[PDB]
Write a protein that binds this ligand. Sequence first.
Ligand SMILES: CCCCCCCCCCCCCCCC(=O)O
Ligand SMILES: [Mg+2]
Length: 247
Amino acid sequence: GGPEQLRRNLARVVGKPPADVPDDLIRASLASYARYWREAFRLPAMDHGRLGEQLDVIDIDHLWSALDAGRGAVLALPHSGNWDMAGVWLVQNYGPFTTVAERLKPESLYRRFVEYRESLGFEVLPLTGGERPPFEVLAERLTDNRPICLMAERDLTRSGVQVDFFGEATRMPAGPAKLAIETGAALFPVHCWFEGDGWGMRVYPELDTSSGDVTAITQALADRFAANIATYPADWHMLQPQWIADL
Ligand SMILES: CCCCCCCCCCCCCCCC(=O)O
Ligand SMILES: [Mg+2]
């Protein structure tokens, strides 16, 4: 989609026609987008121990307490800030975790990305073409009282859950809700953003699963993502189509 699709996505976040999205916001979002890729370049070579010691996560005790209760946890977050840096922080402060990635094309580029995240200490499952269904591995991780992390605000396929997002229809993956219902794992929304020259991260209160309804739960997740993106609009680098009307 590139910058023009980014402008159109920011138009929803901010409630204005694409043409009226503030110039300063478009600028900051492109700078934020550039920063992610500049950090991805060097992140495998940074001092991960130092980063784990010196960065903080607001309300990380949410997660720790879910793991003290033996429940496992689903950390669901949007494409904001540098989520790979948060992953480094979790690897250093808790240990390796499991996640999931679209099997991009070409396979050589997919492998580049796998190597990148594996060098950060993550276990990355292919969304397609792996030995086992990713869901089933994830559920086994949760039942072993482990955290999993899922990028959770975009899934524009037939099986994605339709939710309202900044007042308009989009689709988000059902996995986070499905996994929490099936395993009892706590479903924590997470947000990452850029905090000056550093990184801001927060774990939010777990989502109520009493409804047993994937669509209601995913809507609550979307609502929290929308509130967090609204706080740091420039850090949500969604340059791909997000809302259904843009497909
Ligand atoms: C604040 C608590 C720790 C949060 C850690 C979250 C780590 C997220 C890691 C995601 C890795 C996969 C991202 C690539 C997927 C894609 O966009 O195709
Ligand atoms: Mg309840």
